[PDB]
Design a protein around this ligand. Structure first.
Ligand SMILES: Nc1ncnc2c1ncn2[C@@H]1O[C@H](COP(=O)(O)OP(=O)(O)OP(=O)(O)O)[C@@H](O)[C@H]1O
Ligand SMILES: N[C@@H](CCCC[NH3+])C(=O)O
Ligand SMILES: [Ca+2]
Ligand SMILES: [Ca+2]
Ligand SMILES: [Ca+2]
Ligand SMILES: [Ca+2]
Ligand SMILES: [Ca+2]
Ligand SMILES: [Ca+2]
Ligand SMILES: [Ca+2]
Ligand SMILES: [Ca+2]
Ligand SMILES: [Ca+2]
Lengths: 501, 499, 495, 503
């Protein structure tokens, strides 16, 4: 019984303490890691037992198997690897200390082991200990944080101990971010840090978190995006900047959303969105190949017991135009794109949503109705990497008008395995038009839209100093790690995901 | 010229270009070569040269416009911290009529594209001779100094002050160095929550916010420390995170409410081991970035006192209580008595006698810290480890091996400022609880910075955290001392400003 | 004296082996190069002595200078760099060992130094020895043809020499990366041939005993490269040695290095452009500029800057020859007649242009171009459209009868490149071989042998292709301002 | 069916007719827009039945096959760059119907052609170009084999490369080996250098040289056996790290693993010893196999395709055996003390052992040669995985430094892989007096009989008198490495134009 186990084991190590036995020693000198030990001694023959090499290793006891009173086997784990400790009475510093030490040890315990390399008749690489030291006891009975999702996510440390697939997803997450940095560093992007607390949040349509600063007596918002700060640096004459950082959205959690999440944004002066499409294909495909070995990954939309898809990251990625493809999916013609800002188009998209059973919680604005329709008809068909391009201006308040198609913008979004990955556009750099677009956002806000943008006059002022033609880009790191690890739940790729209380 | 007037006039001029179909903000200008690479490629031309056979496109911002007789205009084109002269005469331009038209259009501050031939003036100034200039983005204001202005419009600061970009390149090299140093040592770069039901890991006043879908309060993190230790329990022996933290407190020359730290945790290490990796990282960082192990610093501004600071290892070490007794000329209580009300009174009397301020609450930890700040930390010009902090100041640090009442802790001080905080980690779950219970008592007796009880973290400790040592470093603070900046606002792109 | 020194030093060294003090120890562990030591401690100040740290360095002693009896300065050199050893008795292992090592050491000796970084009051970066170990004694007294016969002395004493060879090797690395990026395959073809071919030159002959068979050293890789193009490898290159049995002079060595490359579907116009891109990019990248200063008459002569900015000047051989002569030559379609040989012979006599026998059209013509055209070529200059009578492997010119699609690059008066659209018609190639063989039979030692399995390969279909070959040694000469090729060969052929 | 000699006669006469009629069967210039490789990459996404009227491109290649399908439809199998593209020649898409039959009537398998036309894909999903115009660039006057015969493959490599794509891939592997080594050495600061291939005195190895004569200088010259001595003279010059990848020449017999000119990489590293070099060799060889191959494991067919297949594991560290101890173990008997390996007695002992063990050794039956035959028989043959054979006797190693603890031995190793010697390395002998005595012992042997023994090199000994720093050097056969990385048992497989016994 777990609770009784805890009471018993807690009382025992408490006894060790008051009697001065030091169950939490300060320092154990490790000579070699378990990984290096296995690399250096795997070549031994079964039955071997080295007399001229003694080493100190450490790890956690995963299993304790008695073989008579004279012989115990410890399954010792660390670094994603394992090493057997063959504790034989005859090789220990003394037979009485052998009994004493092994009677204390339990599964879960962190230990230090001083011993000789060996291999059993079976051929299991082992260390035969002269001395075993308890470094940290485990006061709890470990799961025979095992399969129950909830326990795994609330106690990630148990998950990481018991399930090596979990450690592997977090390694690849680190490689994603590291790959992106060298990719951008090599292209001359300067890595920067902009404020995560804003008097006025910006850079996206989203509901922010609000705080208060006592000394300065002001309310602050947690950032939605670093976008506006980045463009001000480009006005400043830093032509290539990027930031990999946390963004915060005051919204609900589900399979693809956490209230804090990581993105990479970058801004490149003298680029347009066509250039970013090629950079994107290059970065994403190079990234998949680098870490997984090929351009093809397997996709299980329905878990391990469902259909398996091979997703091909070989460039170039498919491109669809948002308004055209939607009309095709609808089998019906939408208004001319120059009419996408009229109330009548709004009514038309509203009627279409009712008729097609596409829900849209209030406000039923053109932007939100459009996005719901695109989510239903286009996004779900994006298995392979696909750019959805040319977003209407009404859904894109900071993108530059498209140069040949009235009412549209130079904007794309990358979709992979039904999930949005990147959002990019050539940047709106006309201050008068940016201001008019902010004002529309402000009136939507005043009319009951929690997510609408605040007018940022200080940013419009910066645009009045001259933002060179620029293209910028934003990628959700968590989303990429999801698809590179074939995870359908974002909680798989965050170490400590946000959780219902 | 009234700037308001200039703005109003240029705004009109540019509105007119839009209504004339002369789009002043074009979509795409194809730059063939950066200014930096243009300079390095043609840097060996001779005075008077004009390579009519090669044609390139460059771009940048106009920093000066200077006419010279209606058929010859020079634009000082800048970019990437560098300059190139545009020498435009009408003979070489696409058209004489187009030549007049573009010059009448352009102004100082405008971003432009230049298509033209490499060349050099008889004076020996590298130049490009334009066939065509394109307005890419007009500057609607007249361009200009004083700190306020530079910090509130960092883009102006960056355009006019070249030293500014340089400080920020130093900062990004600091960070790239640390990642590279740690990655080589097999540390895994990770990300832990910046929003917590319970903030912990430091002594600090947190920001609080509200998540309405879950109907619950959340604190912005003050440190990632407890999360990192839970990852060590889970068998990731070495982790680090370079990330923002948040503190609801006053701004000053060394404090911003949000700031960047590197924290790392390595199993099987103790604080002595960390003293060694710290010397190698900081010393090697200083040398790699500034070419030398020596940095001169100006606490009193330019034309002030100028200490030369020596980052050669080993760093000097001092014991907190031992040295405080010396700096003071008196014997303090024995370290095993630091929990008593008698000690607090002794410490309080001292602070009154030496005129050391200590806002309420006047607790032992707070009185000590004030005393150490004025007696020890001021003397730390060269990198100096202050070690062996009392336990009442270090609720998450492991007890000292031999000195009762002390802990295995150090702080790294450079130029009178705290850079690092590190210790052998407390891994005994029952001892950690006791120490949280005292933090919660301190919080209820007036201390806004005192820690909350984190039972979930205490539970993690009950599974078995191996002996471990952890470390935290203020990146902004490193940036300050590697750029000779006395104000943290110099090393933050957009520092927090009073409204 | 030198002979005495040798004899005395040899006995001293011999005495050390017999005293169990091995003057040639097996292994000295070097902690840090001299170059890195200098980069690491450039920030020290006068009087500094980092007793904290102890490094091991190594080098050749260039000077031994004792002040008193408890202090000595060794000028340690290595890697084109130098470091002062400040040996003093108080810091050395012991006073007894300090005298012993100093009595033992001499100028020239290779030594290992274990010590602390430091600086003298005078400001010189130093290492202060705990211990100095003799690594390899120099048994001789240290000090153009002396430099060339003992290139190891030259390299010890003249810092400029290693810099030229570093440039030489940078030239070659650059050419491999240029061609590798263009998709060329780096290959290796035989240097020993039954029939030598691919150039007009006199070959070396040797004998393979096992096979009882005469073999020639290659004069060019060209025919094998073309056989690779027939085989479907569209782009091949080889940077290797060629051998010619001929006299030495300022620009000629009996063995030398060429880069040759062949590209299918190219002609000599495409290769002119690649030549400009490669040579100009090479000059700019190595030196730092497209301009190189050239001293034709040594350092105490006139200096003319040479401009490697593309495009290079082009001259047509026959058109410019006619102008530099101030006279009309035979029509280019009459170049195989006996009349025109006599015309050309007469012109060489009238202009005092030497031409040793055989006085054939191809040789009379080459002499004339050498003296009238090639001397004007200081800036990189292409000489184009060579007559067919001097170009047996080149494809005929498609507009000018008698000429071929050929060029040679000239830089600072000397031939650097030879390139052309390749002849790929096997019957025409055979014809031209047959005429080479008649030239051979009539006095010309450089004339080609008939290579019938090359003509057989051409019968399978060589695609239209263009080939190119550059003398690497001559590129090194003009990039190091050397007028003597012995300057850019480590071990040049010496009489 | 037509006979090869007749086919050649007929095709030659036809091509000659084109020439005299002014028809241009060998045009100067065809502009190629795109390579077959880029065409395939750019257009493979097309769907079956597709035909772009939107893109016109010019490609080129050699006809591998010509198959009619009616009279108005011809399929050409076009090959280049190790790759393949179908030319769907359709009468109705060609520039005209009369020009269509005219061009196809003259084209044959083997011909080099240029093709202008549109991308397309057949119903079967076969990527094609649909020509508007096909141009003969170069006719093939011979029938191509309708191949496997080694001798034809090696005497006419251009055919082997045309017909057998496994052959291109071997030579690609070989270029990657060489390119890998340069980057490895350059990155460690080695200076790539070139030293004389013609020597007044050859040296640097025991081998029989080629001899030639320089007329102008009236001098006999030898082709180089090894660059070794020139390299060590550069290390005395203060160039601490030098390497050279170049041709060596040996006047000896040809067989499965020997060509009379072959390629080695030699490098010298000042302040290194042969232990340092074992570690670098492991690093280099194991990284090279993984880089080129994808893993540390390679398959080895000692007996050809239809024989046993061994996995050879290049995972470091490599096995080490000491030459003399392992030899005694294989013999099951004790040899003389290593300090006795220079005596006549020891020679007689080795001679008797060779007779008794059926180990042949042609004259001269010297100790070095008898030991080497015994090591070949009993040790080298067992080296399948990369194996260092170590600490050769001084009598076999005239240029290697004596061993620091084992009298009679040297600090030398050789790397064997799949039964073949790959590398030869040692701590260099830098004592000029000992070097000179070792040369005189070689010269004594030369005058006694063996034409492989070394010449005394007094210029080199003089260089050693100026001080050669302690150094280790290293020599590797590129051809040998290329053999084992492509699983070839015959060196002819990895030389473009191997030496061959006369016609
Ligand atoms: N003996 C030599 N030494 C060095 N380089 C040579 C030698 N012979 C020829 N070359 C170089 O090799 C290149 C191609 O060989 P080619 O047969 O055209 O030489 P070449 O015309 O005989 O040279 P030159 O006229 O200088 O004697 C030449 O352009 C030249 O750069
Ligand atoms: N979390 C600490 C830094 C690391 C302390 C050592 N575990 C702080 O904020 O001060
Ligand atoms: Ca979306
Ligand atoms: Ca989006
Ligand atoms: Ca502090
Ligand atoms: Ca602190
Ligand atoms: Ca010549
Ligand atoms: Ca010539
Ligand atoms: Ca020539
Ligand atoms: Ca051998
Ligand atoms: Ca050998």
């Amino acid at each position: 019984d777990p609770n009784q186990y805890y009471k018993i084991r807690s009382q025992a190590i408490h006894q060790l303490k008051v009697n001065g036995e030091d169950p939490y020693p300060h320092k154990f000198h490790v000579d070699i890691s378990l990984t290096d030990f296995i690399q250096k001694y795997s070549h031994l023959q079964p039955g071997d037992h080295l007399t001229d090499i003694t080493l100190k290793v450490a790890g956690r006891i995963h299993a304790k198997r008695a073989s008579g009173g004279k012989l115990i086997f410890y399954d010792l784990r660390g670094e994603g690897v394992k090493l057997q400790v063959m504790a034989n009475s005859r090789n220990y510093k003394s037979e009485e200390e052998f009994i004493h030490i092994n009677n204390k040890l339990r599964r879960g315990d962190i230990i230090g082991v001083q011993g000789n390399p060996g291999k059993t008749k079976k051929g299991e690489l082992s260390i035969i200990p002269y001395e075993i030291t308890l470094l940290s006891p485990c006061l709890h009975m470990l799961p025979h944080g095992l399969k129950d999702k909830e326990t795994r996510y609330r106690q990630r440390y148990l998950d990481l101990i018991l399930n090596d697939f979990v450690r592997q997803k977090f390694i690849i997450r680190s490689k994603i971010i590291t790959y992106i940095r060298s990719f951008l560093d090599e292209l001359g992007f300067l890595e920067i840090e902009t404020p995560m607390m804003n008097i006025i949040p910006g850079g996206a349509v989203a509901k922010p978190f609000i705080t208060y600063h006592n000394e300065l007596d002001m309310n602050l918002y947690m950032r939605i995006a670093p976008e506006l700060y980045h463009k001000m640096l480009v006005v400043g004459g830093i032509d290539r900047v990027y930031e990999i950082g946390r963004q915060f959205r005051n919204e609900g959690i589900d399979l693809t959303h956490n209230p804090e999440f990581t993105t990479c944004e970058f801004y490149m002066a003298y680029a347009d969105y066509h250039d970013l499409m090629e950079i994107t294909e290059k970065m994403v495909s190079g990234m998949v190949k680098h870490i997984t070995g090929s351009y093809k990954v397997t996709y299980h939309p329905d878990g391990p017991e469902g259909q398996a898809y091979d997703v091909d990251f070989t460039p170039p990625f498919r491109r669809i135009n948002m308004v055209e493809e939607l009309e095709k999916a609808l089998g019906m013609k939408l208004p001319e794109t120059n009419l996408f800002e009229t109330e009548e188009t709004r009514k038309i998209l509203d009627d279409i949503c009712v008729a097609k059973a596409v829900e849209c919680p209030p406000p039923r604005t053109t932007a939100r109705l459009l996005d719901k329709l695109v989510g239903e008809f286009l996004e779900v068909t994006c298995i392979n990497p696909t750019f959805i391009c040319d977003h209407p201006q009404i859904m894109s308040p900071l993108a530059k008008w498209h140069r040949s198609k009235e009412g549209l913008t130079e904007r794309f979004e990358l979709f992979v395995m039904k999930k949005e990955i990147c959002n990019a556009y050539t940047e709106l750099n006309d201050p008068m038009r940016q201001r008019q677009l902010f004002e529309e956002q402000a009136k939507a806000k005043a009319a009951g839209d929690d997510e609408a943008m605040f007018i940022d006059e200080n940013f419009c002022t910066a645009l009045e100093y001259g933002l060179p033609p620029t293209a910028g880009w934003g990628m959700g790191i968590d989303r990429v790690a999801m698809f590179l690890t074939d995870s359908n739940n974002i909680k798989e790729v965050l170490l400590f995901p946000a959780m219902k209380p």
